[PDB]
Design a protein around this ligand. Sequence first.
Ligand SMILES: O=c1cc(-c2ccccc2)oc2cc(O)cc(O)c12
Ligand SMILES: O=c1cc(-c2ccccc2)oc2cc(O)cc(O)c12
Lengths: 810, 810
Amino acid sequence: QISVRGLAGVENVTELKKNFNRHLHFTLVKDRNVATPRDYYFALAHTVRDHLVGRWIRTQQHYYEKDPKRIYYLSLEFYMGRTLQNTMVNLALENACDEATYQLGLDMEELEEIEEDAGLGNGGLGRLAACFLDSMATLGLAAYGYGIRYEFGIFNQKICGGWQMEEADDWLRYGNPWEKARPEFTLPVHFYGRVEHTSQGAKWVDTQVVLAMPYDTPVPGYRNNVVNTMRLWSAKAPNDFNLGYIQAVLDRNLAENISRVLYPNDNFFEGKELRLKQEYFVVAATLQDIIRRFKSSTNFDAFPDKVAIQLNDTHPSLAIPELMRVLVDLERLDWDKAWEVTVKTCAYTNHTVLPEALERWPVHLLETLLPRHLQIIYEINQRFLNRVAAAFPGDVDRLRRMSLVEEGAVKRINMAHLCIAGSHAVNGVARIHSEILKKTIFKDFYELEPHKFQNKTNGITPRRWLVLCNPGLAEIIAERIGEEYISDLDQLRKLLSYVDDEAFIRDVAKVKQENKLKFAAYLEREYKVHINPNSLFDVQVKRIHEYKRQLLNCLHVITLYNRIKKEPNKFVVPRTVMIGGKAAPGYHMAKMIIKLITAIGDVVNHDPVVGDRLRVIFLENYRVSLAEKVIPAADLSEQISTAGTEASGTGNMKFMLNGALTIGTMDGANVEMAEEAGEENFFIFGMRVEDVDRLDQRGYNAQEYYDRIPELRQIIEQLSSGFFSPKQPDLFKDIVNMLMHHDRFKVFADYEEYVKCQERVSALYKNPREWTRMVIRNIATSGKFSSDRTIAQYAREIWGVEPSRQRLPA
Amino acid sequence: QISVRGLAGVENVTELKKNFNRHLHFTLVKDRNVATPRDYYFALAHTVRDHLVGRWIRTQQHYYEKDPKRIYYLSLEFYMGRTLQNTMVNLALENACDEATYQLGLDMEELEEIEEDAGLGNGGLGRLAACFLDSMATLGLAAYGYGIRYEFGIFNQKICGGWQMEEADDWLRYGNPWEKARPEFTLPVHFYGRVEHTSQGAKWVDTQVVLAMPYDTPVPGYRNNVVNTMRLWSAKAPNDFNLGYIQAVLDRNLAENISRVLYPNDNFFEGKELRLKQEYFVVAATLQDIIRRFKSSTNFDAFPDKVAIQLNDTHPSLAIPELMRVLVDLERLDWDKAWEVTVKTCAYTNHTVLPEALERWPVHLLETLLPRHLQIIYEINQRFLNRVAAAFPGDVDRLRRMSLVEEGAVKRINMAHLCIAGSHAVNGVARIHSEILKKTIFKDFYELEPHKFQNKTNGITPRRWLVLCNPGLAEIIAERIGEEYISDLDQLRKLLSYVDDEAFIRDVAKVKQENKLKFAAYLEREYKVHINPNSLFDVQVKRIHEYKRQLLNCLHVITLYNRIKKEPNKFVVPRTVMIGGKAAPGYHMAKMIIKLITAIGDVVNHDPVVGDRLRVIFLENYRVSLAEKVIPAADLSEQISTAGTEASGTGNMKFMLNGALTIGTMDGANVEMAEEAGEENFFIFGMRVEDVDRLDQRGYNAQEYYDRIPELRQIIEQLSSGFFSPKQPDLFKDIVNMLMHHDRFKVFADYEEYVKCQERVSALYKNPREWTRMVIRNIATSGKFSSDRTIAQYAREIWGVEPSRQRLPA
Ligand SMILES: O=c1cc(-c2ccccc2)oc2cc(O)cc(O)c12
Ligand SMILES: O=c1cc(-c2ccccc2)oc2cc(O)cc(O)c12
């Protein structure tokens, strides 16, 4: 139908149809008489998968022959979403498959909706890993994603009586056609035991063994015939495990629990033993695989020339002492040489400055689970602190500040400190964030080793986040400037010359309207909720957090409602306010915020005086597949974290690419987005980082704002008195108390500027032509935020490898 | 190479080769450069599986169209073994695949050895179910095997220091290419809860739900294009199961433990809750499937006309009250009508008279787990006992003897009594066994309902147990009488006219020698054990039991050794005595017997004076695949259970078909085997059932035999004094004590006749021509013992269906 979706050739369509029928018959063991939509989905998935394997085999053969430097991206999370459409897009098969299925009497879009998300992540960190894999393949790097194959991903969120309920994400129930089990490459991982010192070094003995079984998933590059691998480890008990008889077999579950479930925490550290086991499991299995592949190329001098290991946050930090363990205890290298190799191999990406997200593991846990690693960590610490003492003589407090070992009630190991010590490169994820690292939390480390500290501003893949989710926009862009921008997003700048083009303005606005209509239709069909498609779509989708300030959004919503009630017959720009996202199951305040949002909807959506001028909807079960639906439909993107708290954000970039305007604080990547688009084309409000610092030195008193802002006072009175919860008057007492007395994120301080700024948004929306012109200026300058740009910078400045757009032979 | 293995056509070989390469590439994601023997096995398995599916789909379509009466074979065990060669044989693909693999540079026999046994059974009972499935498909019956997909089958047996060690049979580790998961047909099963009585009947409420997910395996008939289904249920937790968060997800294992492991007990009842859950799980899921299929044909009058349910032992006995529950509580039928339907639908096969194998479930377990079923069982009992009282007025002890409820310290339900009450047909598994049932343990029930009681002598499939495991013998038979005997084993009688044929005598003896050479080679390669291929191969393979009397064999072995030591320079017929089989992990005496056998080998195999005249070998890890190797190699088959204890035996039939002579008591099917072959062609010894009864009335005193038999005395002295265990002199005290004071199976009483009979075996073996002539008379009269005969009798006399040899269109 549309150009960017590829060609539908006669030979191709015929071949796809016959292979579809072959899989339905031989693979699924069905005939057309009993086949369900799900069977049809699987037949198509297997048909498309066939096209990958030839390219997959030859790519990996190519790497074996050429022996390039290998990039190993270690992450506890890979938030992949659905795979079918992505694979079709990257293989240029979308139109041919659409035609083939059409001729078989099937609707491909209906089949696409059957696939479960691979929800092996919490949010931003896991989705960044997924975009990175896509860009690494597109840029022709010999890259491998390594993680854990969780049996259960991020929970499915149900809303019951306005409250979040959690249910298991049984994503593998019907099978996963994309993965290939590799039981032949199973590796042992050791836990517990004790350290024996001999004449020839230390030995780790009397351990318990868990097997790590790999499952490989293909990662196709964009139309370059490159297919890289994501290898995810699954936990298996050895066959002599605990070997009365029946109980011993049943107890195998204990070992296999390691890969059972993803911890559902976003930017929060939970110091549980199972989590530590997960972290070592991925690291130990992965490093064996790396060393095996390196030896199959004695001399570990060339190790850093052939291997790069990227640590996605501190979660895989145990790679540092594990690599030391293998090199010193098993390969018999001297400490100094092993350390040189380790430092030159490892690089670390920091994702947040927030204290509650920082991994600080109790010594007593490491002592029991990983006794040899603790000894190695102690030795690293001593040698590192000797360097600090020599560089800064007499500075005793610096020594305590920089130690990997934190003294206190319970001794802990600071994993971020471990990562900096054992990595040649440390990066933040946006310019402001990287500067904060050097100025605040890692200031001491920066003073010792300034050369280690870098910036790599985050990005998103334009394949999933434009071509896939918004084909209508991709097409009208391609009509003007060609197709090359899909792997060279900087070309979008060419759209600046169309800002006064009357045809383009109309087309951009048309695509947005169609997207809004399609999303409004989705809401009625799947959730029976009614929304006005002519209203401004005001959306905030992201994990529920105090720092992300869904609460500030709530206060604006109530302000709008109160203003309408005061002057019912005054015209206001109609809005649909949509808020979605999951709360960590144990995060009480976040769960209260979800209840607040639904409670506001209950009042606002049923007030006859409001009509269709204001609607508040909670978007249930926010996940990658839902993001692909709502983001193209958005008019206004809410990026309103307290300045200095959101390291980068990536949702912000997704909205910018898809024709929404942004209301936001000068936080994370918002700063660079405003810089690229021009501040006149961005709705910036509120405190800057410097203003927050000034307020902190003075002391934040929320009462001051309550006393001086009558509109804010009314809202707090409504919340406290039970306006939004008549049958439970004190339901929101926890929220009010937090706001008034212990608000670390200064919601009240940004309220006035936020409300004022929102008025300017409504004013612009009244002028459709000028709204759309500003949109064009945003889309046109979104190029910097391609993960292709990000990965090219990692490649050149950290990994020491050169990206390539050259095709492999098909 | 050989005729019975089919044709190797030019078109077929070319097509097999190309599909082999297709699967290696697209299915396994490998190329020839990195592929291992295991990869090659899987590529072949997938290639052969392809040939099944067309036939599988059309068979099941045929049943839907014709709507014949359906046979449901319910078993907790299906001892399937390997599937690759069996599938090739039944599809006439063996020679073509042999050719195709040969041209690819592969040895098919090497590839066959890679497949794991599907060891979902303990021994005879589970293997009977497997042979039955094969015969039902071969006879064109619309039959379904229903059971449990155990994650772990019967344990792998290792011998360490002469003792049995158990390890988990992780049979699914590399995947199972034969099964097809059917998650779309998942069904709920209920446990616990309570019974509420309403105005409209009883209701079972507040239950816990476990999901039953079916996996289907094709069962091909012999060259008739019929492919039936074996459906095995797997346990799955519902997604809201226990839904802090992490623990709730981990606790899903508790529900899924139901299908985790096969109870490793052979002819022994262990009254554990997990086992009861397994029994209800299979019954509840299966019955829903049956009723669904029946409705998709209100009127349950025709239910017995369209459905037969066969209970393999009492393990699935809960089918009776479950069917009543569904008909009364859910379909709202009156009790009397529901009962009439149930009785006419269900039939029960008894497998043993031994008291310790009889299922007697504590009432308190059923009360908690299945409260509604207990109420139904009580009601069945009351109505049944009212019939007994009316038939036998005043006979108060009969009422207590016949009750389904057994009073005592703990009240129990006798499941055998439940089965007889609720079945229209009850059968034993050999003539002597069926007569014992009517005379002894079920005498009361026979007096009330004589028409219910039948015999169905067991059998074995000649496909697996001749054509597959012994192609050399199958070929020389086919050369004389054609191929029709493979599905009409009675035709073997035609071989009686070749008993004086000098060419046939030579060929029969040649095939045996080749088999012995091949097995002697297997032993050296896989276990590094040396055996003399010119010796008499004396084998006893079966589960280790007191009743099966491996101990009597041990006593003969020691007698032979002592006799050689007394007269070293006297000629004796050289023997290799092989004993193999698993012991239940908790069965102390059986574990002691294994140790005894190895302990005897340790002395005998290393005595220089013995030389190669006597060797004692314990065959490790006896299972279906090993049976297929050792049985064709056997000269002498040991079937030496105490008269009245082995209900039938099936191993006996396997040896008879494969050219071994039998030494045995008049027990189980041995009686009918001797009747068929003629007693002159069988080595019969020892007490008959009548002699055991006489000894029991008198009282068995083992001391009498010890005192009167000097050779027996010597052995007991050797055992007690530590001749076979010098470093642990009293190691075998438990065995000696049992033999002397509490031997329920009268080992000493059959000793003299056994030893005498063994001398006659050695005498015959000295005359190769006369040995072989007797062998021919055994093979020629083994026809009755085909499971095709057995199944035809079930079909005509129990199920009310007519078997068919007619081909379905290919
Ligand atoms: O997931 C959480 C995130 C934060 C949290 C709070 C402020 C800044 C960053 C993270 O706090 C928590 C507190 C809890 O008791 C339980 C939780 O699961 C969380
Ligand atoms: O598997 C067993 C079979 C018999 C057994 C004994 C005599 C006749 C039939 C079965 O006894 C046992 C006793 C135990 O303590 C444990 C067991 O696992 C078994």
